[PDB]
Amino acid sequence: MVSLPRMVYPQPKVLTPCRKDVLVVTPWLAPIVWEGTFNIDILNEQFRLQNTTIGLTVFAIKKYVAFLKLFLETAEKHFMVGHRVHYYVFTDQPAAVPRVTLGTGRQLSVLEVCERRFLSEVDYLVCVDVDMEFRDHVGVEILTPLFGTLHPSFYGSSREAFTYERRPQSQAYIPKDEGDFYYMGAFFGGSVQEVQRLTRACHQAMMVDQANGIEAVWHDESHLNKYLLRHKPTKVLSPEYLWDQQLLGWPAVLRKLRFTAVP
Numbered sequence: 001m002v003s004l005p006r007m008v009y010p011q012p013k014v015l016t017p018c019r020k021d022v023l024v025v026t027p028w029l030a031p032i033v034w035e036g037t038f039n040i041d042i043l044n045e046q047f048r049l050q051n052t053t054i055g056l057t058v059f060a061i062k063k064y065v066a067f068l069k070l071f072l073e074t075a076e077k078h079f080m081v082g083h084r085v086h087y088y089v090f091t092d093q094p095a096a097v098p099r100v101t102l103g104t105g106r107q108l109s110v111l112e113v114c115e116r117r118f119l120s121e122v123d124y125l126v127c128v129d130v131d132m133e134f135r136d137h138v139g140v141e142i143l144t145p146l147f148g149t150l151h152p153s154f155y156g157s158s159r160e161a162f163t164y165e166r167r168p169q170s171q172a173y174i175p176k177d178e179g180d181f182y183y184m185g186a187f188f189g190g191s192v193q194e195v196q197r198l199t200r201a202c203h204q205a206m207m208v209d210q211a212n213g214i215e216a217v218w219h220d221e222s223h224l225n226k227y228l229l230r231h232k233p234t235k236v237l238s239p240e241y242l243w244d245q246q247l248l249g250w251p252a253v254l255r256k257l258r259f260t261a262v263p
C-alpha cells in the first residue's frame with residue numbers, strides 16, 4: 001500500500017533463472033517457494049508496512065503436549081521473526097502448556113477443548129502439526145490468500161502415485177487423470193477468510209462422507225487435496241517447509257530444511 005523505501009540489492013536477471021532444477025511457478029501462475037526465488041528484505045518491508053499479524057495454530061491433545069516446548073522455542077527463533085505473531089494452542093491440558101519466553105510483539109493464547117475471533121486478531125492463519133520443530137527461516141515469503149505445502153514423499157511423483165482418495169463414493173474423490181500436486185495437511189494457511197472457507201468446506205465434506213458410512217483414506221488430508229484441486233492455492237510451498245531428515249535425508253534440491261518432523 002505505502003511506498004517502499006530506497007533499497008540496495010542485486011538486480012534481478014531476466015535472462016538468468018533463479019532455479020533451473022525446479023519448477024518455481026504453477027500453471028495458474030502461483031509461485032512455488034524455494035530458497036533462491038525470493039529476497040526476504042523486500043518481502044519483510046512489504047508486510048511490515050502493512051503491520052501484518054500472523055496467527056499460528058497448533059492442536060496438542062493427549063501426549064502431544066510434550067512437543068510444545070521444542071515447537072514454540074524453535075518458532076521463536078525462525079518463524080516470522082520481526083513481525084507480529086499470535087500463537088493459538090488448542091489443548092485438552094491447559095496447565096501442561098510450557099511457559100516459553102516470547103520475543104516482543106508476539107503472544108500466545110491457550111484455548112481449551114469462535115472463528116470470529118481470528119478475523120479481528122490476525123491477518124493470516126498458518127495451521128501446522130505440533131510434533132515438529134523449526135530449523136531454519138520460515139517467514140512472510142509464505143503469506144498469500146491461500147497456500148498448500150508439497151508433501152515430501154510425492155513432490156517428484158506422477159499423479160497416479162498420489163495417495164488421493166480414489167473411491168467415487170467419497171467427497172474427497174479424485175480420479176487418476178486429475179491432480180496438480182499432493183499437498184500435506186501438516187502445513188497450510190492463508191488469509192483468515194480463505195482458511196475458514198477451506199476448513200468449513202472440509203468439515204461439511206467430511207460430514208457427508210460420515211453419513212455415507214465412508215472415511216477418506218487419509219482423512220483431513222484427503223479433503224484438503226480435493227479442496228486445493230478445485231480452489232488453486234495462490235502460493236505453493238516446496239518440501240523445504242515440510243521435511244524429515246531421518247526418513248529422507250538432505251537432497252541437493254533442498255538448500256534449506258526449515259520445518260521438520262521430530263524423531
Ligand SMILES: CCCCCCO[C@@H]1O[C@H](CO)[C@H](O)[C@H](N)[C@H]1O[C@@H]1O[C@@H](C)[C@@H](O)[C@@H](O)[C@@H]1O
Pocket residue numbers: 151152153163184185186218221242243244247261
Ligand atoms: C514428513 C513425513 C514423511 C513421509 C512419511 C509417510 O507420510 C504419510 O503420508 C500419508 C500420505 O501418503 C499421510 O500424509 C500421512 N499422514 C503421513 O504420515 C506421516 O508419518 C506418520 C508416521 C505420522 O508421523 C504422520 O503424522 C505423518 O504425517
Ligand SMILES: [Hg+2]
Pocket residue numbers: 057125126127195
Ligand atoms: Hg488453522
Ligand SMILES: [Hg+2]
Pocket residue numbers: 057058059126127128
Ligand atoms: Hg491447526
Ligand SMILES: [Hg+2]
Pocket residue numbers: 199202203206220223
Ligand atoms: Hg475437516
Ligand SMILES: [Hg+2]
Pocket residue numbers: 198199202203220221223224
Ligand atoms: Hg481440510
